[PDB]
Amino acid sequence: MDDQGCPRCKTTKYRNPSLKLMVNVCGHTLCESCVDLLFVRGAGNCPECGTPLRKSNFRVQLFEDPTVDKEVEIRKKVLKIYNKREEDFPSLREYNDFLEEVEEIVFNLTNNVDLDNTKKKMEIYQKENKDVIQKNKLKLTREQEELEE
């Protein structure tokens, strides 16, 4: 609403707050006026970055900061890992130790390649998918419902 808009169609955004920007894996602001062109050629390629999209991969977002958009999208994904609860650790450092690397991964993934990140995530997934992810999924969804209630 306050921001100019898409690098191409930066005009309707000033008119009304009903129109919302769309986020994509490329972390690029897009909307129907621009999106319609992305389907006629390439069929899912970022205009300036050229990065392909597996599908439409469009989601409604109302944040002017594309880094937050990426960081939130990354956050939401990374929260599926390393999210074991506090009772798992006896030492105070452990409660935020993994959160350090997790926040580094989330932050670094906004700029750096995910090669090492995916490898580490996969190397830990092979271990965490057995029990802690199964248990934390229940506790996370339960506490999420408690947050909603």
């Binding site: 309707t12 319609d36 006629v40």
Partner: protein, 86 residues
């Protein structure tokens, strides 16, 4: 803006296949109708001649260049409008 949106939507709907004889461009929806298995290639019903497709990149790229610059140059008026909305 409505005209530009119409021109953008047109840039998305422009036909891709085309006939060099009658200078007619055909949308990809007709591809099954244009492709003749007896010939193994696309042909024009009116001209009974080969129909081309690869040139369809030119209109898509070219139109974007003209339409995009419109918003870039109108910036002073938009700023003056934002400054005069009150």
């Amino acid at each position: 803006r409505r005209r530009i949106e119409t021109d953008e939507r047109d840039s998305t709907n422009r036909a891709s296949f085309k006939c060099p004889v009658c200078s007619s461009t055909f949308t990809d929806l007709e591809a099954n109708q244009l492709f003749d298995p007896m010939t193994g290639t696309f042909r024009c019903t009116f001209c009974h001649t080969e129909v081309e497709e690869d040139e369809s990149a030119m209109p898509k790229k070219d139109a974007r260049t003209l339409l995009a610059r419109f918003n870039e140059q109108i910036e002073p008026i938009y700023a003056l409008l934002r400054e005069t909305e009150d």
